[PDB]
Curated annotation (Swiss-Prot), chain B:
It is found in: Virion; Host cytoplasm; Secreted; Host extracellular space. A motif (Nuclear localization signal) lies at residues 1-7. It comes from Severe acute respiratory syndrome coronavirus 2. ADP-ribosylated. The ADP-ribosylation is retained in the virion during infection. Phosphorylated on serine residues by host GSK3A and GSK3B. This promotes the solubility of homodimers that would otherwise aggregate. Host phosphatase would dephosphorylate the protein during assembly at M bound membranes. Belongs to the betacoronavirus nucleocapsid protein family. The lineage of its organism: Viruses, Riboviria, Orthornavirae, Pisuviricota, Pisoniviricetes. This is Nucleoprotein. Residues 1-107 form the CoV N CTD domain. Residues 1-104 are annotated as: Dimerization. The gene is N. Residues 3-83 are annotated as: Putative NLRP3 binding. Homodimer, homotetramer, homooligomer with RNA. Both monomeric and oligomeric forms interact with RNA. Interacts with protein M. Interacts with protein E. Interacts with NSP3; this interaction serves to tether the genome to the newly translated replicase-transcriptase complex at a very early stage of infection. Interacts with host NLRP3 and ABHD8; these interactions disrupt the association between NLRP3 and ABHD8, increasing NLRP3 stability, ultimately leading to increased inflammasome activation.
Length: 109, 107
């Protein structure tokens, strides 16, 4: 299997198979409701979320990058913020869609 | 949008993503040569090897939303573990460390 950062989740190799379970810890992802976790890029509204992911150039250009070492190895750390356009005609739906998936695991039944 | 921009010799890292610096939403990555070249940089493929796919970006990161006087911001934090079994591991560690906070050494 490809290095983690190059994995593409789909129904056949889903979000928790490729990127681990959702949770509150620093090395855990917190994004994705039950539908997105199970479907990955097969998720119907996936393109509306992917529009906000950065290109390789923007990931290294916009982010604060670091290099940390832990008992498990060497990690490339990254942090940043992407400004949405609150004048985009779909701004209201984009906010609803992102929030729907942000910390969705906290209310899984 | 800014997150889909591609920096090149004609539209460099500073023009596309702002000057490097120490602040929280300020990019700190790139020596003068990478800032000048962007994706045209001699070792750009070795750097792009660490950039996440859209799926890994939303799968690995801690995503949030912050609404302030400047707008609505999608925040992100995470860490990508290097594979110490990758034959390029030594070069990857040296290359990343070279460009992290390189701006501190020049105007
Ligand atoms: N750091 C950062 N600045 C941004 C982003 N989007 C827009 N800006 C800033 O927003 C300001 C207003 O310009 P505009 O948004 O109309 O292009 C600019 O000075 C620009 O740098 C973003 O995602 N990140
Ligand atoms: N959160 C996180 N865990 C990772 C990453 N790469 C590997 N791991 C985890 O690190 C452990 C060691 O696996 P290895 O990749 O060294 O065979 C496993 O628990 C694996 O899931 C990564 O980029 N992020
Ligand atoms: Cl561009
Ligand atoms: Cl190269
Ligand atoms: Cl060098
Ligand atoms: K989970
Ligand atoms: K790119
Ligand atoms: K460290
Ligand atoms: K939408
Ligand atoms: K993808």
């Amino acid at each position: 299997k490809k290095p983690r950062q190059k994995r593409t989740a789909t129904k056949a190799y889903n979000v928790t198979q490729a990127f681990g379970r959702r949770g509150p810890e620093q090395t855990q992802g917190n994004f994705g409701d039950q539908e997105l976790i199970r479907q990955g890029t097969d998720y119907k509204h996936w393109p509306q979320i992917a529009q906000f992911a950065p290109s390789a150039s923007a990931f290294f250009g916009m982010s604060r990058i670091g290099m940390e070492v832990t008992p498990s190895g060497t990690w490339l750390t990254y942090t940043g913020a992407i400004k949405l356009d609150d004048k985009d005609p779909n701004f209201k739906d984009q906010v609803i869609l992102l929030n729907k998936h942000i910390d969705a695991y906290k209310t899984f039944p």
